[PDB]
Amino acid sequence: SLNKLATEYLGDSFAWQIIADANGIDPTKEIDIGAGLKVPDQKALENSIKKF
Amino acid sequence: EFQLQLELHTSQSDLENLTPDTALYIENTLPFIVGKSWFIESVRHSFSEG
Amino acid sequence: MYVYPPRIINGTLYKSTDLAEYTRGKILQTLSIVRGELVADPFFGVPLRLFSNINDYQSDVSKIQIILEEEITEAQFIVTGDLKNNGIVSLTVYWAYLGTENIENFEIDTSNI
Amino acid sequence: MYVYPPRIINGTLYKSTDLAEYTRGKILQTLSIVRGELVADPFFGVPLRLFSNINDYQSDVSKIQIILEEEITEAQFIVTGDLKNNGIVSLTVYWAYLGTENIENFEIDTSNI
Amino acid sequence: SKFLKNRAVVNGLPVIKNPGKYQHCYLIEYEDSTNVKQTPTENKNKQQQGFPVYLFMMNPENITYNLPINYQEIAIPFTAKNQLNYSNGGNIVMTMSNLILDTMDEKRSLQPLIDRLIALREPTVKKGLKSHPKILAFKWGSNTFAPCVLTNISFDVTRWIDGYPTKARVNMSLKEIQKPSSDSKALEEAKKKVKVETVQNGNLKKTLSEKQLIDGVKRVTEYLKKNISFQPRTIQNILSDPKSVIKIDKDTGQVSLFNGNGEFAALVGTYNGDIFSPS
Numbered sequence: 001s002l003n004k005l006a007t008e009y010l011g012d013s014f015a016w017q018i019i020a021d022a023n024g025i026d027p028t029k030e031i032d033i034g035a036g037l038k039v040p041d042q043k044a045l046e047n048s049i050k051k052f
Numbered sequence: 053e054f055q056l057q058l059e060l061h062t063s064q065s066d067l068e069n070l071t072p073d074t075a076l077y078i079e080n081t082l083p084f085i086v087g088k089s090w091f092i093e094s095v096r097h098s099f100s101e102g
Numbered sequence: 103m104y105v106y107p108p109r110i111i112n113g114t115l116y117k118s119t120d121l122a123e124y125t126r127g128k129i130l131q132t133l134s135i136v137r138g139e140l141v142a143d144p145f146f147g148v149p150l151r152l153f154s155n156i157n158d159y160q161s162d163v164s165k166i167q168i169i170l171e172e173e174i175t176e177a178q179f180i181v182t183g184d185l186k187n188n189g190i191v192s193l194t195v196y197w198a199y200l201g202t203e204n205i206e207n208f209e210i211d212t213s214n215i
Numbered sequence: 216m217y218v219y220p221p222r223i224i225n226g227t228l229y230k231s232t233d234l235a236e237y238t239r240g241k242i243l244q245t246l247s248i249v250r251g252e253l254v255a256d257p258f259f260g261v262p263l264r265l266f267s268n269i270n271d272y273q274s275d276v277s278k279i280q281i282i283l284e285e286e287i288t289e290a291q292f293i294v295t296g297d298l299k300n301n302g303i304v305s306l307t308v309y310w311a312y313l314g315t316e317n318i319e320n321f322e323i324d325t326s327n328i
Numbered sequence: 329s330k331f332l333k334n335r336a337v338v339n340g341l342p343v344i345k346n347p348g349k350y351q352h353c354y355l356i357e358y359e360d361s362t363n364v365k366q367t368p369t370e371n372k373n374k375q376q377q378g379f380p381v382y383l384f385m386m387n388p389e390n391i392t393y394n395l396p397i398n399y400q401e402i403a404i405p406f407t408a409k410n411q412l413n414y415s416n417g418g419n420i421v422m423t424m425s426n427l428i429l430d431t432m433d434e435k436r437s438l439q440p441l442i443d444r445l446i447a448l449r450e451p452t453v454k455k456g457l458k459s460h461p462k463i464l465a466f467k468w469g470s471n472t473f474a475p476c477v478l479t480n481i482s483f484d485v486t487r488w489i490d491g492y493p494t495k496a497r498v499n500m501s502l503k504e505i506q507k508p509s510s511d512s513k514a515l516e517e518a519k520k521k522v523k524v525e526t527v528q529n530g531n532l533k534k535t536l537s538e539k540q541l542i543d544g545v546k547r548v549t550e551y552l553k554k555n556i557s558f559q560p561r562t563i564q565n566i567l568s569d570p571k572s573v574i575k576i577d578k579d580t581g582q583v584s585l586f587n588g589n590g591e592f593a594a595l596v597g598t599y600n601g602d603i604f605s606p607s
Contacts, residue, residue: 007144052528101405250363258376262364270349277470278362285510 002027009039018045056090062097070095106131109215122199122206125177129197132173133166146173159183159191166193176200219244234289235312235319241287242310246279259286272296272304279306289313353387353468354380358475358508361465381464382444388424395420420504422466422473427498437492438485445500448478466502474504531579534601544576544599548583551604552596566593 006016020027022038031037040048058078060066076090105127109116118124137147148166160183167181177197184192199206218240222229231237250260261279273296280294293309312319356379363378370379396418402411429438451458466473480501487495509516520526521533536544552574556564563585566572571588576599583596583604597606 003141003144004138007138013141013144047523047525050524050528052530099405101403258359262362264364270347271351271469273345273347273470274467275364277472278364281472282362 005037005039010042010045056085067097106134116210120206120208121176122202123208123210125174125199126197126208128174129170129177129195132170133195156185156191159185163193166195170195170197219247229323231323233319234314236321236323238287238290238312239310239321242283242290242308245283245286246308269298269304272298276306279308283308283310347469351387351469353384353466355382355464355478356380356467358463358465359510361467361472380467381448381462382441384427385430385441386428387468388427390424392423393420394423420474421479422476422502422504423500425497425499427500429496429498430494432487432489432494435489436494437489438494438496439492442483442493442496445478445481445498448481463505463508464502473502475507476502476504479503532581532600535579536576536581536599536601540601541576541578544581544583544604545574547604548574548576548596548599551606555606563594563596 002016002019003013005019007013010018016027019037019039022040025031025037056078070092072092072095074092076092077087078085078090080086103118103124104115105118105124107116107127107130132146133148135147136150138144140146148169149162151162163181163183167179170177170179170181177199180196182194182196184194186192216231216237217228218231218237220229220240220243245259246261248260249263251257253259261282262275264275276294276296280292283290283292283294290310290312295307295309297305297307299305357376360376360378363376365378367377371377398415398418400413400415402413404411429441431438448461448464450461452461453459461477463475463477466476478500480499482499483493484497484499485493485495486497487493511519517526524533552559552567556567559567566585566587569588572593573586574596575584575586576582577584581599583599585593585596587593595607597604599605
């Protein structure tokens with residue numbers, strides 16, 4: 001589930017919103033078995049912050 | 053007419069009764085210091101450890 | 103306050119004013135939840151290892167004891183493990199409520215449900 | 216991006232949007248360039264020692280491994296060397312792309328020109 | 329002790345094949361630690377030839393590695409513990425003592441080796457400038473230590489021939505240093521800018537060159553003369569003046585029209601390195 005992915009990889013259960021936002025997927029909808037997903041890193045989430 | 057620097061270990065009575073409104077009397081010291089009222093210009097209480 | 107096990111008694115949630123039975127309910131809640139069962143806090147809960155050979159069966163006892171001490175600070179916990187015959191590992195958690203000095207009997211247990 | 220081996224496919228260079236095959240092309244480019252072949256940077260490349268003794272054939276393996284980790288930071292490299300019969304020294308480079316969690320096949324490999 | 333060893337951690341370690349030759353360790357210049365003996369014989373006048381700085385005549389009997397990790401204590405009064413705050417990691421110190429140099433039977437002087445090891449204190453001459461000594465790498469078989477520098481060396485000589493040492497014990501200490509960057513500074517900044525992981529105000533990552541400025545003026549003039557019919561009045565009437573020029577900013581690429589008086593009139597668009605984007 002997205003909760004497990006947010007917990008294992010991001011260390012926070014409410015971080016799942018990022019993962020879905022990183023994949024354009026509606027969480028209420030079904031994810032087929034064998035479908036690929038993209039999970040953000042913890043240490044590599046800070047370089048998505050653009051400073052200007 | 054005289055200046056006195058007193059650095060000493062703080063006690064409770066040395067905390068409540070040592071204010072610039074009191075008159076200091078130092079005993080067991082030099083004769084010209086004993087028996088005279090010393091006006092406290094200032095008091096400082098430092099705490100670096102226990 | 104409401105104690106852990108949700109029971110509708112006399113049309114309402116069981117409401118208790120004695121903190122010893124509330125602590126007992128908290129112990130039951132902690133032991134009845136495993137890490138990864140709660141969503142808000144996926145880390146709270148006892149660690150469960152069920153299908154494994156019985157060699158390091160004291161480590162989980164120690165982990166459960168430590169978790170009980172950290173989560174519940176109003177009670178003292180001592181956890182012991184015994185090996186039964188077929189596949190059963192019998193855990194015994196001795197707990198005492200620091201608020202009381204004597205063993206406190208609860209009347210809800212005597213009631214027949 | 217343009218993978219290392221310049222192949223005109225469908226009238227244009229092979230432009231791939233998957234970083235796994237781009238990383239594989241990077242490994243192939245690093246292994247295919249000998250020190251000095253490149254002008255701008257004469258230090259980039261794999262050291263080549265061919266007509267010599269095999270008494271110290273593992274030092275070259277270690278140097279190739281270090282070069283692979285230094286040049287390509289998005290993959291993990293393990294280089295192993297074994298001795299064949301006539302003159303062949305077989306090098307095996309085990310690489311994994313850290314971005315992905317599972318081994319990824321490439322559909323261009325099955326394509327036969 | 330092979331009955332008490334933890335097989336779980338042992339079996340997770342790589343298996344190393346025995347060399348067919350007795351190996352001797354050596355010190356090499358860093359970045360020359362990957363070069364392979366470019367010539368049969370070492371040439372002093374050329375660099376990066378893959379030859380060791382110092383070849384050990386006998387291997388060390390043991391090597392000591394020391395690593396201190398620096399935390400800082402803050403003693404808050406009436407607390408059970410000090411407050412430990414991580415400061416820094418520290419450098420590995422490698423030490424090999426009681427190294428054997430022995431040429432007494434060969435009647436060969438050790439003085440060249442001692443001179444070679446001593447010369448590691450002198451400054452080098454990168455270009456025409458005094459620089460730091462050579463950054464070293466201790467290599468033994470397939471193993472290396474680090475980019476390191478020789479810190480302390482000592483010799484105890486017990487035998488001589490004609491005043492020349494022939495038997496000595498050598499104690500030396502190397503220290504691991506921070507790995508030098510092979511990305512210079514133009515490249516390190518450029519690749520920082522490429523991933524836009526740098527702080528960006530509003531300028532282009534590539535400041536326009538004079539030829540790029542000329543070509544951008546060309547593109548702007550072409551587009552303006554093509555689209556003069558659809559320009560609003562306030563711009564076509566200033567372009568009707570032959571004394572109007574087009575100026576492109578060097579850092580932001582903004583294109584501007586300047587009238588006969590030489591003042592700014594209107595913004596036309598933006599020009600990066602390749603494409604002109606009208607406003």
